[PDB]
Each structure stands twice: as C-alpha cells, then as structure tokens.
Amino acid sequence: TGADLWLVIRTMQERLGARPVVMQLPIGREDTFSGIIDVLRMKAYTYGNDLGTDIREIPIPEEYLDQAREYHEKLVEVAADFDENIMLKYLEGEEPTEEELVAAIRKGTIDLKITPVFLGSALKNKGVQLLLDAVVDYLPSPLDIPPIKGTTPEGEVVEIHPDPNGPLAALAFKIMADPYVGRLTFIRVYSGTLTSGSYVYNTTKGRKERVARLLRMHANHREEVEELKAGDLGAVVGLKETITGDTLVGEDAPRVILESIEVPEPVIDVAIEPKTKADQEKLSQALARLAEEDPTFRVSTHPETGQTIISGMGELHLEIIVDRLKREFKVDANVGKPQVAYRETITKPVDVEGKFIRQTGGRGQYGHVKIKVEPLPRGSGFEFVNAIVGGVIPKEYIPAVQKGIEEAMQSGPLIGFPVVDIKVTLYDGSYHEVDSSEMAFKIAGSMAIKEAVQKGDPVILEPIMRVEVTTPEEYMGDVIGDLNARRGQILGMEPRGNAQVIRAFVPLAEMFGYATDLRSKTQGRGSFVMFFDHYQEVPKQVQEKLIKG
Amino acid sequence: ARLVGRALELTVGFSHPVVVEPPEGITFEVPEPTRVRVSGIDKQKVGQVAANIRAIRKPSAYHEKGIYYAGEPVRLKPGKAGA
Amino acid sequence: KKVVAVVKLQLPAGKATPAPPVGPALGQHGANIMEFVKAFNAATANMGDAIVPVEITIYADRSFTFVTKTPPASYLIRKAAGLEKGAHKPGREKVGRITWEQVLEIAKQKMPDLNTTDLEAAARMIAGSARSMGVEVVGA
Amino acid sequence: AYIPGEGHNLQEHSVVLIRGGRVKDLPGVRYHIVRGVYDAAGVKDRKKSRSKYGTKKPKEAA
Amino acid sequence: MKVRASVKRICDKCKVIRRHGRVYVICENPKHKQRQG
RNA sequence: GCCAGGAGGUUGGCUUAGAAGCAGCCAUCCUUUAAAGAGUGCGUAAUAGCUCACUGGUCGAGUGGCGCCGCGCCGAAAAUGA
C-alpha cells in the first residue's frame, strides 16, 4: 500500500529539477497487481503471478488503454526538445517509428535530459524483464561515455580512449580479502588491454606489478578470463602493493595517471581511551589493519590532551567501526568524550613585588623585579615592553627575565594551562654585580608572574568554533533553535541558492559530535564545516564545577 | 472503511480490521472508505457512537493519522522533540 | 503554464539578488526582477538608494512589470534633522531639531503616501512620529 | 628513535625505520629514522643527502 | 501543573469547572491541566 | 453569540545576526474613521498569519466587575476491625 506513480514523479522535479518521462504503467494498485503496460513500444507485458512462473502480455484489460495513451503522446511530445524528426512528427501527428524512441529517448537519457521511469515489484516478481530490456535499450554503453579526464606522466590533460589497442591504462578500486587468491583488487581499467599471466606497473607510487589472473564475478561462481579489454571490467590477483584509486598502466604504457580526486572529509569526532596504554599501541596495530583496509576515517591524536582520536564521516559508521573492534579485535576502551584545549587569561592591572632577597652562600642569584602587568583582548597576542624606569636591570636580563614571564605562563594558576592573549610590561628592579645571574631574574619573573596572575582576576578561555549550517529554511529555523540551545550564538544568515547557509558561533565543549544531532533535525539536507574562530569565558558556574583534582 | 451486509469493516492503524455493528435505534452507512456516515435517530446514543469510533482509533497522534469528526487537528513536532 | 500572479515586496535599492521569499513567489512568475534592479536604481538617480516598495507580476506567457514607490519617513528624517543612526532612545537624547520647513518637506516629499492624502494633517502627523524616533522640535 | 633532521611530520606512526647510531645528544640516539619509509619523505626541498632526506630527483623542469 | 492544591486560571483561555465534585482547570492545551488535589 | 471594518507613518526609536504591535529599555504619538491600539494572546528564524481590543449590521432582556458575612468543598496519609 502506497505503491504509485504521480507520487514518485512529483517528488522528482520537486526535490531536484529533473524531467521524469516514464515508460510503463501499472495494472492494479496494492495487492491487486498483475502486470505493466509500456507506453514505449506500445505493449502490455503482464505477469499473472508473483513468483513469475507463468506470465503474459494481453492488451489493456479494458479500463486503462486511453489513460496510458496520453502519456504515450507525452513521450513523443517531449522528444521534441532534441532532434528535428520527432518534433515535426508530432506536429504532423505522424506515428513514431518504434526505434526513434530508442533514439531520441536514449539520446536524452544518456544526455542527462529525460528520466526513463521504468518501475515494478521485486518480491512479487513483476515489472522486471521490461526494465532489463530497458537496460539493454536505454542504459549507456562505454561508447557514449565521454573522454575520461586525468593527468599525464608529465602534467596537463589526458584522453582515456576506449581503444582496445591503446596504451595499457587502468583504474582499480576495492581491496578484497580471499582464502585462495588472497588480496583481490576490483578494477575498471579504461584504456588498454591486459593479458593473463603478464605484468603491469603501478602508475601512482611507482611499482612494477605482476598480474596473475584476471577475473569476473559472474553472479554465482567466479569466471577466470584470458584478458581485460579496454573499457571492460574485472578483478585481479597479486598486485602486492596496489591500494585504492591507484592508476595502473602496463610495464611501459606511457606511465599515465588518472584524475579522480574525491574527498571523505571529517564530520565526526568521538574520543576513545583504552584501559591501560598497553592495550593502546596494540590497538594501533588494530588500526594498522583498520586504516589499511578502509580509507575514510582519520586516526589523529590530539596535542593538548593525549588519547588518539577517531575522526570520520559517519555516526553509525564510527560506531560499527567500534563494533568490529569489540568483535574481532576485542579492545577494552571506555569510549571517551573528546577533551578540550583550555587557554586562559585575566582582566585587571596588578602591581606586584617580585623580590628575591635570598643571599645563599655568597652568590645569591637574587632578583628584585618590579613589574606592571596589563591585559588586552582575546585574540591580540603576547606583549611585554623593554621598560626600564631609568637604567636598572642589566641588558642581559632583557631577553631572559621575560622568559620567566613566558616560562611561568605555560602553567596557569587555576587548573593550569597556557595563559595567552595578554600584554604584560614591567618597570623597575634592583641589580648587584655578582649577586645576580640571568636565570635569577628569570625566576624573579616566575614569582612575579605567579603572584600577578593568581591575584589578577582569573578566567578560562575555552575555544569556540564557527560553523556553516548548509541546509534549507525549514530545518534552518529548527537548527538555529538547537544552536542557541548550544550555549553559543550564530551570527550569520546569508541566503544561498538551493540552500540557505547559517554562519554560527558554537562553543567547542558543546557542539560535540553535532552531525549526529544535525543529521536528524534536517532529516538529511547536508551539514556544515569546522571553521574555528576564537575563545571566550565559560559562564561562571562552569568554571568552578570543573575545579577538580 | 468497508460495509459488508450489516457490519462495518473499517481498517485503521490497528493490525486488524475494525468490525462495528449498527445496534437498535440508529443506523450507520459507509459511502466511501475515507469517510463513514451515520444516520442517527437518537441524538443521545448518537454522539456516543460517534465517540465510539473516534475513540476506537484516536487521531492527531502527534502529527496526524486517525479518526476525525472534522475537528481541526492540533499538531506537535514530528521527527523531533525526543532527545 | 502559470496564470496571473502579482506579488509585491519591499526590496531596498542595492540588493541585486532573488533572495527568498522573492523566490517562492516570483518563481511562479519567471521574474525579470533583474530588470527591476537596473531600471529602478537609476529611476531614483537623485540618491540611487533608500528603501523603496515594489510590485511585480506575471501574464501567462511570462510577462513582468515592476511598480515602484517612495522612501520611508524615519530615513527621510535622519537625512534631514542630522541624525546619524538616531538620537538613542526617544525618551532621553535628541540630536537635531525640526522647525517650520524641514517638516514641510518631510510631508511634501511623502505627499502621496502617509495616510491622509492631505497636507493640513500630515505635517503635525509625522511631527509626532518625530517624537517617536527621538527628535526634539523648535516651536513658534 | 631520532630523525634525519629538519622537516617533520611524523605525528605518531610513520614506521620510523629503526636504523642505528648514538651521539652526545639524547641518552640513546640509537636506531635512527629514515624519511621515505611509510612516512616523512625528507625535507621539503633538499639538495644533498637525498639518500635518506627524501626528495626524489630535483627536476626543476627547466 | 497537573494535580496540585493551587489551581490557577493561568492563560485566560482556561476555566474552573466544578465537575465530578472537585475542581479542575480545563483549556485547550492539556499542559495547563490542573486539579484540586 | 453571530456577520463584518479590524487600517496608514511602521520595520516606533533603542538594541540586536535580525527584535517588523509582539525576547528586552524608553516610550508615553498623529492621521484616514462610525471604529481599529505603537497592542492581548498564539504563532515565525525575525516577517507572515491567527488574534483580542475597539465599532457598526443583526438582537431582543437584563449583564459585567469588586468587597463582606453563614454553612459547607479541595486542602486531608499509618498500620489487628469498624
């Protein structure tokens, strides 16, 4: 129930903009099915049963006929946006020769113009042979597929011909496992003949390759072939290096390369922390055969926190990845939430006394540093001034007293992380010929900085990303809702074409795995891009709640 | 909504056909399957059976789908609002 | 085919885009709003800008027609009484001052718009709308 | 495991090709890296030690 | 709301209807569905 | 109760990514009118719309609001059987 025509049709030019000319019409809506009519060749192939053991093709049962007839007319009428014969023929009211249909229609079909809607039902084997015939009639041969793009062994354009005498030049795709013929590469050549038992050579990372046996997955059993032709398709054994998307020419064959540069860009970011880091490198071997059988994902550690991160382009994707892990790799890794790099700063001018009045066994290393410290905008940078009130602190502390300002600014006072985006300054000090080393005033700077940042108005500058919601208006309003509900704030709404994209502030702590969320609120109308901006405060209470140990 | 002989065999969201039977004092009558008609000769026991079928398969279920007198459906967010 | 759909909007002078809901109203039109953009900007060459009302239409065989109108009185007061963005809040701060002639042109310009297509009401009318935007007045 | 010098990436895998040779640096410097391997492939633009420092054959195509 | 000793007419579209003995506060939205209990 | 007008400066100004009677601060109009407010509530991403307000058509007799006092009602659950 729900099996229809106008449904699908409407949906086509209402969800993309196609041109759904169809060529077959049903005999009985839901349960009441018995076969199809064909406004193409003007015939009514009808299947008198589900299994399809005894089918037929009698004319219209009485009520249809005229119905499909107008659509037949439509067919020829639409064919007026192509040649010259058909158009003028409908003008004449002349009958289309049964094969100019095959013409003008396969014309538009392969020309990406018309939408040869053939249809049917699977379980009740109906509406089948009509579309197999429709394959053998309207589905494009490699003769009609235009010059395939690519690069040279030098650097320009390419012309990959269907030529079964042309230079061996191929592509390959899938990396199959196998017991007997092991590593199996599923390939579609392009231009160039290849022998069973000869050689080849990878035209990517360069590797002379032995071709063992060309093969064709013939439905049930697999069929071993003598050769692969220029344009034909098949899978080969050997190629003990060939990965995926590799361009493969022969041993010679002007070492040409294929264009095809696709992208499995990151959209998911889930963390993973195995129990003890012994299981970890072990699972780096797990990944060693995970990242080497399935490209896609990116296994990138974070810098400002340990724990390798699993990034990728799919929710359930990453998840059944994790399943395969807890299946044939058995790892104990309490799948963690992604951590955050937290910088920090202040908002006040504090004057302090970095006085190191300490005369050890004579050498001291005493350093009285009088600094003024000033704070400025989050995004500015690090400042300091060559500020001597008159001529106090030696010119050998100048690039090394401020070190202890920098040095003691990798470890913040709170939970302790790099305190950034601040000015600083200085102003005075005290100096003594022997009783003072470079590092003495470096550490005077350490003391100075610690007191002047502990007592200086603490804060935490957690990072915040910009994000481009790529989606239409409906779910746009919806997601603007969500994003407000994600602690941050938006700030961008430029009306695009088939979409309307929203530039959005969202707080990196929040916005965790937002695709999973997004991929729902819009059902599926695209997504966004990770466009990181800058950092700002966590609204008071989130700062102290995080004060742990 | 079908009507065979005396009984009405409507088929709603339920996994089985709904089988009602016009009792003493009133008559139903199903013109087309998309809308049942009820000639009720008893204003009291009438709306009781209207409500019988309405409450047999209640409509509006968040988005839509069900049995409406004609009372304009109040919506609520469909594939959403369940975190 | 699409028969008669007159849809009018509020496109200011400078935006050369069919941005929604200009699409789902003038798409069922086949709108030469691009022609509205390059024949109305020059029509008001005296400033070539300001927010101006419009009216576009379709006649079966895809036939367009734009109909333009006049600038608004809060912009047509900002240019006059020397306001920048405004006199921040109508109950506190004031910039310029409206006398017995600036008001005259405020009504003159916008004669065929306000409400009453009559002069002897319009002046005082927007002179009150003046206080709604936050501009003081010299009274004589 | 060390490295053959300037021009790095290496992150966390690389298949750093355990090689051999200590110095007065890092209490170890034993079993060096190679650049080329599964990763690194030498200095972005190197004109000499291309026998480990990656870069193929500086064809400036001119 | 929904069942509490302090029943209000909240959004004016609600009524107090002393049905079946005790007080309810009915409207359109069943979210306002108080009760004197 | 029912039919219907339910307006124009306008998107008040201030804000603000936008705040359009309608998230928030000040405000604290004036006009076409019989009557329509710088707005009561829903709704929107903000507009849109729905909407009250207000006023006539119908109508034909009583209504809308606030306080007080008497008795109640909810408030009001525990252990063997009342």
3-state secondary structure A481-532: HHHHCCCCCECCCCCCCCCCCEEEEECCCCCCCHHHHHHHHCCCCCCCCEEE
Do chains A and D touch by CB distance (3+ pairs < 8 Å)? yes
Note whether A457 and A346 are within 8 A (CB): yes
**Residue B71 touches partner A, C-beta closer than 8 Å:** no
Assign E16 to helix, strand or coil: strand
Contact residues of A toward B, CB < 8 A: 478, 520-521, 523
DSSP state of C137: B
CA distance A36 to chain D (A): 58
The alpha-carbon radius of gyration of chain A (Å, integer) is 35
CA distance C19 to chain A (A): 6
Alpha-carbon gap, residue A240 to D38, rounded angstroms: 15
CA distance A468 to chain C (A): 18
Phi-psi label, residue D22: left if phi above 0, alpha if psi -120 to 50, beta otherwise: beta
**Residue A473 touches partner C, C-beta closer than 8 Å:** yes
**Residue D13 touches partner A, C-beta closer than 8 Å:** yes
Q: What residue type is A233 in one-letter code? A: L
Note whether A236 and A213 are within 8 A (CB): yes
Note whether A441 and A393 are within 8 A (CB): yes
CA distance A282 to chain D (A): 13
Q: What residue type is A162 in one-letter code? A: P
Instruction: Look up residue A93 and give its two tokens.
Output: 């009211």
| Proximity of residue A496 CB to strand F below 7 A | no
Instruction: Look up residue B54 and give its two tokens.
Output: 């309405």
Instruction: Using CA coordinates, name the residue in chain A closest to C20.
Output: A495
CA dihedral C7, C8, C10, C14 (to 10 degrees): 80
Residues present in chain D in total = 62
| Residue-by-residue DSSP string for A166-231 | SPPEEEEEEEE--SSS-SEEEEEEEE--EETT-EEEETTTTEEEEEEEEEE--SSS-EEESEE-SS
Alpha-carbon gap, residue A148 to A137, rounded angstroms: 23
Residues present in chain C in total = 140
CB atoms within 10 A of CB A148: 19
Q: What residue type is A451 in one-letter code? A: E
Alpha-carbon gap, residue C98 to C105, rounded angstroms: 11
Treating both helix axes as pointing N-terminal to C-terminal, what angle do A98-110 and A85-92 enclose, rounded to 10 degrees? 130
Assign A85 to helix, strand or coil: helix
Alpha-carbon gap, residue A102 to A116, rounded angstroms: 11
Sign of the C-alpha dihedral computed for residues B65, B68, B73 and B75 taken in this order: negative
SS3 string of A335-372?
CCCCCCCCEECCCCCEEEEECCCCCCCCCCCCCEEEEE
Tally of CA atoms within 13 A in the half-sphere of A446 that contains its CB = 13
Instruction: Using CA coordinates, name the residue in chain A closest to B83.
Output: A517
**Å from A18 (CA) to F45 (C1')?**
30
Residues present in chain A in total = 549
Nearest residue for F48, CA–C1': C21
> Which residue has 């290393």 as its token pair?
A365
Alpha-carbon gap, residue B25 to B39, rounded angstroms: 10
| Proximity of residue C91 CB to strand F below 7 A | yes
Instruction: Look up residue C138 and give its two tokens.
Output: 């010299």
Sign of the C-alpha dihedral computed for residues C123, C128, C134 and C137 taken in this order: positive
**Å from A126 (CA) to F33 (C1')?**
72
CB contact under 8 Å between A301 and D11, yes or no, is: yes
Q: How far is CA C15 from CA A11, A141, A419, C19, in A?
A: 32, 47, 45, 9
Alpha-carbon gap, residue A153 to A274, rounded angstroms: 46
Q: How far is CA B7 from CA B3, B18, B67, in A?
A: 6, 10, 18
Alpha-carbon gap, residue B49 to B28, rounded angstroms: 10
Pick from A278, A376, A289, A378: which is nearest to A328 by CA?
A: A289
For E15-33, letters b (16+ CB in 10 Å) and e give eeeeeeeeebbebeeeebe
Q: What residue type is C132 in one-letter code? A: S
Note whether C90 and C51 are within 8 A (CB): no
Pick from D32, D31, D55, D41: which is nearest to D10 by CA?
A: D41
Q: How far is CA A496 from CA A470, A471, A479, A480, B64, in A?
A: 9, 9, 16, 16, 32
Alpha-carbon gap, residue B63 to A477, rounded angstroms: 19
**Residue D11 touches partner A, C-beta closer than 8 Å:** yes
* A523 chain-B contacts, CB cut-off 8 A: 79
Q: Which helix (H) or strand (E) holds A478?
A: helix A473-484
Q: Give φ, ψ of A57 to 5 degrees.
A: -170, 35
CA distance D23 to chain A (A): 28
Q: What residue type is A240 in one-letter code? A: K
Alpha-carbon gap, residue A240 to A238, rounded angstroms: 5
Alpha-carbon gap, residue A327 to A508, rounded angstroms: 32
Pick from A264, A265, A267, A263: which is nearest to A511 by CA?
A: A267
Nucleotide with minimal C1' distance from the CA of C92 is F26
CA angle B7, B13, B15 (to 5 degrees): 75
The alpha-carbon radius of gyration of chain C (Å, integer) is 18
How much helix, strand and coil, in percent to the nearest 5, is found in chain D? 0, 0, 100
| Those residues with Cβ within 8 angstroms of residue D52's Cβ, 6 or more apart along the chain or in another chain | D4, D34, D35, D36, D42
Q: Give φ, ψ of A320 to 5 degrees.
A: -70, -20
Pick from B55, B14, B9, B59: which is nearest to B33 by CA?
A: B9
* Edge-to-edge order in the sheet of strand A298-301: A268-271, A308-312, A298-301
**Å from E10 (CA) to F36 (C1')?**
28
Instruction: Using CA coordinates, name the residue in chain A closest to C17.
Output: A495
CB atoms within 10 A of CB C27: 15
Instruction: Look up residue A53 and give its two tokens.
Output: 């053991």
Strands A194-195 and A247-249: unpaired
| Proximity of residue C90 CB to strand F below 7 A | yes
**Å from B65 (CA) to F50 (C1')?**
24
Do chains B and C touch by CB distance (3+ pairs < 8 Å)? no
Assign C19 to helix, strand or coil: coil
| Those residues with Cβ within 8 angstroms of residue A480's Cβ, 6 or more apart along the chain or in another chain | A469, A490, A502
Alpha-carbon gap, residue E18 to A523, rounded angstroms: 46
| Residue-by-residue DSSP string for B25-59 | T-----SBTTB-----S-HHHHHHHHHHHHTTS--
| Those residues with Cβ within 8 angstroms of residue A118's Cβ, 6 or more apart along the chain or in another chain | A22, A23, A24, A127, A130, A131, A134
Strands A502-506 and A460-469: antiparallel
Note whether C135 and C83 are within 8 A (CB): yes
CB contact under 8 Å between D11 and A300, yes or no, is: yes
Instruction: Look up residue A193 and give its two tokens.
Output: 């003949």
**Å from E24 (CA) to F80 (C1')?**
38
Tally of CA atoms within 13 A in the half-sphere of A534 that contains its CB = 9
Instruction: Look up residue B56 and give its two tokens.
Output: 């047999």
Note whether A96 and A76 are within 8 A (CB): yes
> Which residue has 């466009």 as its token pair?
A531
Residues present in chain E in total = 37
Pick from A457, A465, A452, A421: which is nearest to A543 by CA?
A: A457
Nucleotides of F under 7 A from a protein CB: 7-15, 17, 20, 25-32, 38, 41-42, 44-47, 73-76
Alpha-carbon gap, residue A141 to A135, rounded angstroms: 10
Sign of the C-alpha dihedral computed for residues A432, A434, A438 and A443 taken in this order: negative
Q: How far is CA B37 from CA B13, B40, B50, B56, in A?
A: 20, 9, 10, 16
Cβ-Cβ contacts under 8 Å between A and B: the total is: 5
Nucleotide with minimal C1' distance from the CA of A474 is F45
Q: Method of determination?
A: X-ray
Query: Is the peptide bond prior to A295 cis by the omega test (within 30 degrees of 0)?
Result: no
SS3 string of A281-316?
HHHHHHHHCCCCCCCCCEEEECCCCCCEEEEECCHH
Alpha-carbon gap, residue A43 to A27, rounded angstroms: 13
Q: How far is CA A302 from CA A271, A319, A353, A418, B9, in A?
A: 10, 20, 38, 16, 64
Instruction: Using CA coordinates, name the residue in chain A closest to D15.
Output: A288
Pick from A81, A94, A84, A62: which is nearest to A21 by CA?
A: A81
For A442-474, letters b (16+ CB in 10 Å) and e give bbbbbbbbbbbbeebebbbbbbbbbbbbbbbee
**Å from E22 (CA) to F61 (C1')?**
34
**Residue B6 touches partner A, C-beta closer than 8 Å:** no
**Residue A495 touches partner C, C-beta closer than 8 Å:** yes
**Residue B80 touches partner A, C-beta closer than 8 Å:** yes
CA angle A75, A79, A83 (to 5 degrees): 160
SS3 string of A413-472?
CCCCCCECCECCCCEEEECCCCCCCHHHHHHHHHHHHHHHHHCCCCCEEEEEEEEEECCC
Pick from C63, C64, C45: which is nearest to C54 by CA?
A: C64
Residues present in chain B in total = 83
* B80 chain-A contacts, CB cut-off 8 A: 478, 520-521
| Those residues with Cβ within 8 angstroms of residue A212's Cβ, 6 or more apart along the chain or in another chain | A181, A197, A236, A237, A238
Instruction: Using CA coordinates, name the residue in chain A closest to D13.
Output: A284
Give B11: exposed, middle or buried? Use CB within 10 Å, 0-12, 13-18, 19+. Answer: middle
* D12 chain-A contacts, CB cut-off 8 A: 284, 301, 308
**Å from E8 (CA) to F77 (C1')?**
25
**Å from A465 (CA) to F16 (C1')?**
21
Alpha-carbon gap, residue C135 to C96, rounded angstroms: 7
| Those residues with Cβ within 8 angstroms of residue A525's Cβ, 6 or more apart along the chain or in another chain | A470, A471, A472, A475, A499
Note whether A33 and A126 are within 8 A (CB): yes
The alpha-carbon radius of gyration of chain D (Å, integer) is 13
DSSP state of A11: H
Note whether A369 and A354 are within 8 A (CB): yes
Sign of the C-alpha dihedral computed for residues A98, A104, A109 and A114 taken in this order: negative
CB atoms within 10 A of CB A527: 18
Give A317: exposed, middle or buried? Use CB within 10 Å, 0-12, 13-18, 19+. Answer: middle
Note whether B26 and B40 are within 8 A (CB): yes
Instruction: Using CA coordinates, name the residue in chain D closest to A307.
Output: D12
CA distance A473 to chain C (A): 9
Alpha-carbon gap, residue A333 to A280, rounded angstroms: 9
Alpha-carbon gap, residue C118 to C112, rounded angstroms: 9
Scan residues 52-81 of chain C and list those with Cβ within 7 Å of strand F. 72-74
Instruction: Using CA coordinates, name the residue in chain C closest to A493.
Output: C19
CA distance D4 to chain A (A): 22
DSSP state of A37: E
Sign of the C-alpha dihedral computed for residues A436, A437, A442 and A447 taken in this order: negative
**Residue A308 touches partner D, C-beta closer than 8 Å:** yes
**Residue A543 touches partner C, C-beta closer than 8 Å:** no
Residues in chain C preceding a C-to-N separation beyond 2.5 angstroms (breaks): none
Scan residues 1-37 of chain E and list those with Cβ within 7 Å of strand F. 5, 11, 21-23, 36-37
**Å from E12 (CA) to F53 (C1')?**
15
Alpha-carbon gap, residue C32 to A72, rounded angstroms: 35
Alpha-carbon gap, residue C92 to D19, rounded angstroms: 80
Q: Give φ, ψ of A136 to 5 degrees.
A: -65, -10
Q: How far is CA A225 from CA A183, A197, A212, in A?
A: 18, 11, 11
